Amino acid sequence: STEELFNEYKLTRPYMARCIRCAVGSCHSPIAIEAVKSDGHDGYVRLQTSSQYGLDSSGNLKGRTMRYDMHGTIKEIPLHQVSLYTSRPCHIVDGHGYFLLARCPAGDSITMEFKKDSVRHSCSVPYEVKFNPVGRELYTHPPEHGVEQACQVYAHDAQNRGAYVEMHLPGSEVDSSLVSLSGSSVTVTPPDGTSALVECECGGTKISETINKTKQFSQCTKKEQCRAYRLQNDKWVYNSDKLPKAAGATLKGKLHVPFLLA
């Protein structure tokens, strides 16, 4: 169990990605759904999510835990606290990496939900989920008995097969909460023990990167006048299209896809 998770979670960094329908309007969800694969037969789907499964916020193996990024802070929830449904409630089978194996009915969309502190985080995406019967009898719910036939299903194993996805260097993510305002002066206080690239345009242009503790850029009057991008770039992230790209050579390894069709 530990050998599978080496490259997946020694270097993990779950991310926050845009969701078009997140419990009110569209926002940036911690559980944004990237892909839903439903090519198996007996209603088994393999989701790819921005959150991560099977370990805690520190990076050590845990039984059934969904781990999500919240405004830069990596947090945890039990996997039984997460709900999934296409048209009727789904039943999560397991989770591994960015991927989640669930048993879903057919539906025109898929929705993932959970409530952590007081608010309900949801993400619904319009990815059609298909139920594919096996054989020459078009059932909708698998029978209690019959005859065994060969079929392709998304297996409940997370071993390293031949399928991989890429991990990349995360791009700098702007955080406007760092930029506070002292008396007529912007002030950037990066997160404790972390750098911050303050790209600041007012009278005189400023690209001060190496700030670590606190800086006061008195040349600039209002907070909204310039940005303070957050730099960690120590844990690498999936090559999502809902994240900015980091300049230079970005590829850093391969993540094996679990729950492959078997």
Binding site: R18, D39, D241, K242, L243, P244
Partner: protein, 49 residues
């Protein structure tokens, strides 16, 4: 595009891949970081149907 063999590989393990799916990139929605694309639905799934 949209028919059997829209993507083709000489063997399963071959590194070559001929793809013709009418992949077209669209303009991103205002204030959103994402890559909007449009392409013909998979021809393998359509053939299976």
């Amino acid at each position: 595009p949209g028919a059997f063999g829209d993507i083709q590989s000489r063997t399963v393990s071959s590194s070559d891949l001929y793809a013709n799916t009418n992949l077209v990139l669209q303009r991103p929605k205002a204030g959103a970081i994402h890559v909007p694309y449009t392409q013909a639905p998979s021809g393998f799934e359509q053939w299976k149907k």
